[PDB]
Design a protein around this ligand. Structure first.
Ligand code: NA
Ligand code: NA
Lengths: 199, 199
């Protein structure tokens, strides 16, 4: 079990397929930002990107030749926009999406590098930057941060990331092993919901 | 997937073993309140209660004779304190724990009655009542609610309940089916983290 201050701690412990699943989840949640941008500026790349991301998800339960991975990253780079070459805001979330998928692909080649923490921060920043651009003009810093605290996009993003990480954290096979983890989490080392224990 | 306002909605859809697991999780998190009370007032019932709760958890993956269930509830009633017969506060969380376990036991006999919503509200109220008693004396209502909003026991309880419900919500066998649900949740019906879609 992880307390209300232990999101980043579960994230920091993700490894193997669970880390990949978390990275792909962050990218999937961002994908329509890529599709919308590609459409808006008349690129015909939305469909090709959807396939590359589909393939990244399929790779979770398939062997893939290491030798094949650099070409996948190369394809991604050709679909990835340069933020300086487009004036519309939408290019920024489009680029952020590509960075998320890049991490998931790089992780297949170099799985031992930890990525989930920084990918999670990036995924949050996409939402914060968008709220700031769309609603923050003329606000003092402290007003903006009050907008952030109650903004539904940021409340939802936070709980999406946490739900995903925690679903992965508890997941086990078979069912019995899953229930043992859920139980252990509730038991909380013998410390109740009121912060007391029979120590 | 469930948004930041959809905790109670996932809870309301729990059924079968998942509902039982959620009820048992709420009781397990409360159990040390029972143990502490039983100890404090010199009852020798903590160990007997621990066994009954252990049995409730074991029942999750075992057939049990319906005919045996009323006797389990009867045993629980004999371990359950009357709040009016003890002056110390600790009796109240002790009683709340018994109510949580009672729901889990009743659910085995009558599984079709929905219980998780009200059990979740009770489990929250235990923490709110305790914060109010221990810290709220002399506070205006609106001050108290500001304490509630940032109190670590209440922040943690909220995320414990949500982590548990969501772990159950996503769980499937085999691994592939679990990953399909996690993916679907991230895809969010084609609506990105910025609230946009290619509709
Ligand atoms: Na890694
Ligand atoms: Na039920």
């Amino acid at each position: 079990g992880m307390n209300a201050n232990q999101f980043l701690k579960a994230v920091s412990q993700l490894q193997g397929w669970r880390e990949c699943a978390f990275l792909l989840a962050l990218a999937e949640r961002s994908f329509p930002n890529y599709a919308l941008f590609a459409d808006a500026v008349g690129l015909k790349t939305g469909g090709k990107m959807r396939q590359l991301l589909d393939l990244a998800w399929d790779m979770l339960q398939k062997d893939v030749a290491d030798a094949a991975i650099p070409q996948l990253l190369s394809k991604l780079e050709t679909l990835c926009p340069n933020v300086d070459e487009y004036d519309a805001y939408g290019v920024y979330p489009a680029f952020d999406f590509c960075q998320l998928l890049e991490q998931a692909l790089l992780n297949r080649l170099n799985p031992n590098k930890h990525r989930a923490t920084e990918a999670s921060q990036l995924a949050t920043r996409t939402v914060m930057d968008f709220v700031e651009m769309s609603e923050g003009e003329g606000m003092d810093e402290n007003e903006l941060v009050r907008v952030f605290e109650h903004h539904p996009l940021l409340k939802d993003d936070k709980l999406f990331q946490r739900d995903t990480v925690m679903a992965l954290y508890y997941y086990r096979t078979p069912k019995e092993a899953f229930l043992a983890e859920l139980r252990a989490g509730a038991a909380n080392d013998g410390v109740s919901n009121l912060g007391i224990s029979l120590e």
